[PDB]
């Protein structure tokens, strides 16, 4: 109706104001608190900035186009479409950049985490990310939108041509999903291998320690039946198995301590092995001086290392789940558009792309950007507290 245009324009203005307020609050929480300015926040800022410009550009300029009468030129219309692609693809490309940074920080942690690269490239990536979207969306459709008819002006002219639509669909969405999944799988597999070797090696060390303690308990309660050799045989085996569990001077500290321990057990055994009448009352107590002084350091140190690997695994799992739910929301919002333009390309001359659901789809992509700052504080609750 005639009165519906004003109501829809007011609703669109309210939605744009809400999006702008959310993004401004996110930017303020970023710029005020200096704690969220590390590597874990440089590649996340554009996710709250680019889409922000959408609320300033896409939603308002759409009002004269639909609610009011079209009073803008074609150049203005193109620029709007241009902002729409640049700011849109920027989100998924920043997600890809975050995934690549995490892959470099986890897979190449032996060199990147130990020695961080210069920051002069960080911004060099960020802006490039934007221009990347341009190189994907800027020129191509510009060459293919050369149509004379003015029907569906700010609808892209490169439609109804299934080849470019199919190619772009893949580049904009499928290719990013691949890179993100590859990086996440590499990170998870590397961390599982780092923890599996640790879990097994620490379990083997604990089993050897438990066996050495059970044998030493019997050694302390020596029997008159010359049972020292039967208990020490097991003790020697335990020591030799725990000695070969490699976690340099630090390795020599560990190895030498074990060598001493094995030599102490070897001399303790001598009395029983010789068959000499005197076993010196099973004098292998001195092992307690070596058990709690030399080999205790690694028994405590390696345990802490396993704990470090586990927290890291939980943090990587949280980050992977966050990236996964972000990509899932993006896909759920983007798919209705891709399912209403490459399947309806068979007929587009008259009333083909003109329908309610297609307009709803256009809104849905904008909505992805509306909920983006709503689900952004879900990753870090600092914004919520501040």
């Amino acid at each position, epitope marked *: 109706s005639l009165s519906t245009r004003v109501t829809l324009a007011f609703f669109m203005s309210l939605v744009a104001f809400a999006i702008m307020l959310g993004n401004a609050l996110v930017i303020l929480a970023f710029v005020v608190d200096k704690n969220l300015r590390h590597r874990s926040s440089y590649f996340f800022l554009n996710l709250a900035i680019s889409d922000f410009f959408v609320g300033v550009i896409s939603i308002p300029l759409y009002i004269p186009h639909t609610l009011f009468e079209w009073d803008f030129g074609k150049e203005i219309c193109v620029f709007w479409l241009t902002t729409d692609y640049l700011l849109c693809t920027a989100s998924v490309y920043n997600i890809v950049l975050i995934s690549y940074d995490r892959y470099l920080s986890v897979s190449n942690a032996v060199s990147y985490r130990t020695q961080h690269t210069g920051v002069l490239k960080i911004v060099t990536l960020m802006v490039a990310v934007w221009v990347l979207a341009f190189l994907v969306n800027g020129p191509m459709i510009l060459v293919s939108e050369s149509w004379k008819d003015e029907g569906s002006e700010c609808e892209p002219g490169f439609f109804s041509e299934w080849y470019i639509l199919a190619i772009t669909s893949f580049l904009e969405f499928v290719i990013p999903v691949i890179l993100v999944a590859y990086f996440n799988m590499n990170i998870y597999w590397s961390l599982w291998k780092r923890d599996h070797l640790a879990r097994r090696q620490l379990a083997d060390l604990e089993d050897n320690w438990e066996t050495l303690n059970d044998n030493l308990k019997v050694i302390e309660k020596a029997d008159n039946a010359a049972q020292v050799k039967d208990a020490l*045989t097991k003790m020697r085996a335990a020591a030799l198995d725990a000695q070969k569990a490699t976690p340099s001077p630090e390795m020599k500290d560990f190895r030498h301590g074990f060598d001493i321990l094995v030599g102490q057990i070897d001399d303790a055994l001598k009395l029983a092995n010789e068959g000499k009448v005197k076993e010196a009352q099973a004098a292998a107590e001195q092992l307690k001086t070596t058990r709690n002084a030399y080999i205790q350091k690694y028994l405590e140190r390696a345990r802490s290392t396993l704990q470090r690997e586990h927290v890291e695994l939980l943090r990587a799992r949280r980050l992977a789940k966050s990236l996964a739910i972000l990509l899932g929301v993006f896909a759920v919002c983007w798919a209705p558009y891709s399912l209403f333009t490459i399947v309806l390309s068979f007929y587009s001359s008259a009333t083909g792309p003109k329908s309610v659901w297609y307009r709803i789809a256009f809104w849905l992509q904008w909505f992805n950007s509306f909920v983006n700052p709503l689900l952004y504080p879900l990753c870090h609750k600092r914004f919520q507290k501040a």
Partner: antibody
Amino acid sequence: VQLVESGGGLVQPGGSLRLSCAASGFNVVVFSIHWVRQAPGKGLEWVAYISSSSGSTSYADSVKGRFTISADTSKNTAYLQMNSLRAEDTAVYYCARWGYWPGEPWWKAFDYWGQGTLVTV
Amino acid sequence: SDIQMTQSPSSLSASVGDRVTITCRASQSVSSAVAWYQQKPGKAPKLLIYSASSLYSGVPSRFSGSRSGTDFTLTISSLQPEDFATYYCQQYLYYSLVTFGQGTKV
């Protein structure tokens, strides 16, 4: 190095038999010597161990009580004497070298075996 | 007690140039203390695989081995006329704990 044996011969049951193992260049104190017997057409069987250092001698389960092994560092040789033979010790005796615990000498044991000697009861 | 070394094969025959796998086990767990030896009629036993999976200088790479728990494996990928002899397993966990295996004829 070759640990040659020169105690080949035939003895009567219960009589004393003397064997000799000689080092061919390696110090006997830095490397202990172990004896292993092999019955004709049977598996290898351990006999005894001698160390010129720490003076530790250990015998097997079935040969203890009638075997005496002694090593002189100056002679660089090891002598094994069988005080009593019960017709079950008829075998070929070899002497091989063993390494002490520190380092790779332990992990590599029983290398550079000797030709052997025939002991018939 | 005396740890017993059981060699699973006792007699085996294979064509020249085939895979031969010999298995040895011990009652009590041993850690890299089982070595493989080769004896020919009229010669002395020779060390080939020491430790658990490693070769001493003087033996070609064809001879190999592996360890898993208390199971030790001798793997000969390529047979040749020279390598036909009895193979013995030997545990050297201690000086007074030496126990040779049964022996496998190849």
